[PDB]
Design a protein. Structure first.
Lengths: 200, 426
């Protein structure tokens, strides 16, 4: 929603729109495994004026590559004015969540299993038992290839995104079907109306 | 072009035979430079260098060198110099008046008013600029020299003299353009075939130039393309490269650049380089059993000549690049056939600690090509996976989702545009 509306012809800047691009930063960095770069056909003065207004935010984007608690703490204290400006309590540990996103995602394609005590040592993780705790909520996140070995302390990856083998696959694709269907439907409808253009 | 550079020092030189090898400006240049990160062997390097300032006498560099001399001498005096500086100043005035001698000569020869007289004027002008170690206006003559060359031998003259300049001029872009020229541009096949399969290949000098280019230019592909092209029958240039450095330099630019097949062709079926081949038995069997993969002692002498490539002025500036891609391609070499990377004996080979081993590997993870994972308790990888079809599936769906995303985006974009929509400035 943000990006599709922010390429709109923009010449008036708003701290409202500042909260907009800030929260967009929040998602696009936290929500992603790394940074997004956008279709840069947004405002002339606005998109390029708030862009230095996004000084701390580009640097914090770099921070997404950094993995340092103290600096992000300091910047959070800086922007706490925005952190709670609309009862948006929790944005900082949203950032921390993106942090452990990076942690776990790195860990993802590394290996099959480690000394997960030693891995918690590895990944700046705050608690080995705790480590499996958020691992297992990733299991509530339903994504992880991990597993619960109290005895051997073993967490493996299991590499089953899909085995291309489903009526479920059929459902994914039928979704694709009807979606693209109506997509092309309004393509043809809007084309149709382009036919309605006057003497030209 | 000095990199700070730490030590730092390697005792693995013999400078007497280096000055036997190299000469001129570059001689004392590397003398200085090596001495810098080679203290106390700094000593004799700089001693013989300054005596080379007693050789055609650039005594400005004498000033610099005895400056360093007394500096490190007093610094020495913790441990435990005496020099004929005044007579040096006398001979200095001698040199300067000889400068004036040849200047008067120069202007005489200006007055001669002969295009070939003009050309030899350029020649000898740059000559004495070389002589007393101050070089500037020399270039002008050679900067002027091209305006006096028309014929094929005139092309020969312009090219070889501009680049013989560049021996200590040492400037790529224009002079590399003229390497390209003098090999190709004038009188295609050069009207001389570069000496018709050039007996003494100044092509070799062209090669050295472009090789240092893609040293700095770092496009080492054509670098090694020329490095293989070593043609012994040029047979002489003390400023060209020491055949030790010649072969090591070239072949290791290659050993960075290559893919194994044509390079073994370049190496095992190297013929033109075979003398250059047979120069360093060290680096020869180094790369031999490297491709044969005795990684342990290969890497051993690798980072043993660490210090001596450092001892190269020109191997120093890319030691990290080299050793980087070296151990990279060491990986690339052995790892490719396997399916599950066991480490134990293999680590016994590479001589990296189990953690350091696997963190090398972790690095590898950062870029690596195999869909591979490790039971650390295996102390062993399993390498890349199997399917690419389903991979295509997932990329397909990612495709489609962002497609529909863009599609709605552009629907709404048609709205915002055709709904007049924008943002005013205030």
């Amino acid at each position: 929603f943000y990006e599709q509306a922010i390429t709109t012809p923009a010449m008036a800047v708003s701290h409202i729109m500042l909260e907009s691009y800030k929260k967009y930063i929040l998602v696009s960095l936290i929500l992603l495994g790394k940074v997004q770069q956008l279709p840069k056909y947004t405002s002339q003065i606005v998109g390029r004026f708030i862009k230095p207004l996004s000084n701390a935010y580009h640097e914090l984007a770099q921070v997404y590559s950094t993995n340092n608690p103290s600096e992000l703490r300091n910047l959070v204290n800086k922007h706490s004015e925005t952190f709670t400006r609309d009862n948006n309590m929790g944005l900082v540990k949203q950032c921390l969540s993106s942090l452990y996103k990076k942690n776990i995602q790195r860990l993802t394609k590394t290996f099959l299993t480690l000394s997960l005590q030693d891995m918690a040592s590895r990944v700046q993780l705050s608690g080995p038992q705790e480590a499996e705790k958020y691992v297992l909520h990733m299991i509530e996140d339903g994504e992880i290839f991990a597993s619960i070995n109290q005895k051997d302390g073993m967490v493996s990856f299991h590499d089953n995104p899909e085995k291309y083998n489903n009526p479920a696959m059929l459902h994914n694709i039928d979704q694709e079907m009807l979606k693209c269907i109506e997509l092309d439907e309004r393509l043809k409808a809007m084309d149709q109306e382009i036919t309605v253009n006057p003497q030209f | 072009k000095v990199y700070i550079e730490k030590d730092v020092e390697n005792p693995s030189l013999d400078l007497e035979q280096y000055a036997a090898s190299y000469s001129g400006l570059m001689r004392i240049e590397r003398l200085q430079f090596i001495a810098d990160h080679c203290p106390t062997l700094r000593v004799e390097a700089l001693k013989m260098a300054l005596s080379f300032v007693q050789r055609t006498f650039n005594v400005d560099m004498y000033e610099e060198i005895h400056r360093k001399l007394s500096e490190a001498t007093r610094e020495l005096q913790n441990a435990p110099p005496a020099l004929d500086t005044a007579w040096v100043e006398a001979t200095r005035k001698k040199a300067l008046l000889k400068l004036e001698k040849l200047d008067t000569d120069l202007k005489n020869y200006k007055g001669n008013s002969i295009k070939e007289s003009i050309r030899r004027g350029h020649d000898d002008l740059g000559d004495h600029y070389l002589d007393c170690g101050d070089l500037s206006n020399a270039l002008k003559c050679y900067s002027r020299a091209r305006d006096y060359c028309t014929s094929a031998k005139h092309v020969i003259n312009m090219c070889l003299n501009v680049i013989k300049v560049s021996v200590y001029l040492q400037n790529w872009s224009h002079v590399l353009s003229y390497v390209s020229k003098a090999e190709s541009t004038p009188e295609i096949a050069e009207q001389r075939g570069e000496r018709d399969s050039q007996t003494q290949a100044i092509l070799t000098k062209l090669k050295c130039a472009a090789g240092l280019a893609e040293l700095a230019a770092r496009k080492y592909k054509q670098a090694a393309k020329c490095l293989l092209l070593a043609s012994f029958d040029h047979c002489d240039f003390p400023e060209l490269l020491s055949p030790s450095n010649v072969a090591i330099y070239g072949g290791l630019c290659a050993l960075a650049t290559f893919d194994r097949q044509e390079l073994q062709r370049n190496v095992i079926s190297s013929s033109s380089f075979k003398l250059f081949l047979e120069l360093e038995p060290q680096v020869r069997d180094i790369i031999f059993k490297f491709y044969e993969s005795k990684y342990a002692s290969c890497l051993k002498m690798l980072d043993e000549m660490k210090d001596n490539l450092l001892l190269d002025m020109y191997l120093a500036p890319h030691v990290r690049t080299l050793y980087t891609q070296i151990r990279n391609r060491a990986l690339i070499q052995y790892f490719s056939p396997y399916v599950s990377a066991d480490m134990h004996r293999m680590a016994a080979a590479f001589n990296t600690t189990v953690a350091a081993l696997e963190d090398e590997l972790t690095q590898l993870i950062l870029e690596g090509l195999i869909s591979a994972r490790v039971d650390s308790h295996s102390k062993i990888l399993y390498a890349r996976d199997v399917d690419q079809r389903s991979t295509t599936f997932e990329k397909s769906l990612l495709m489609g989702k962002e497609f529909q995303r863009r599609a709605k985006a552009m629907m709404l974009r048609a709205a915002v545009l055709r709904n007049q929509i924008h943002v005013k400035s205030p």
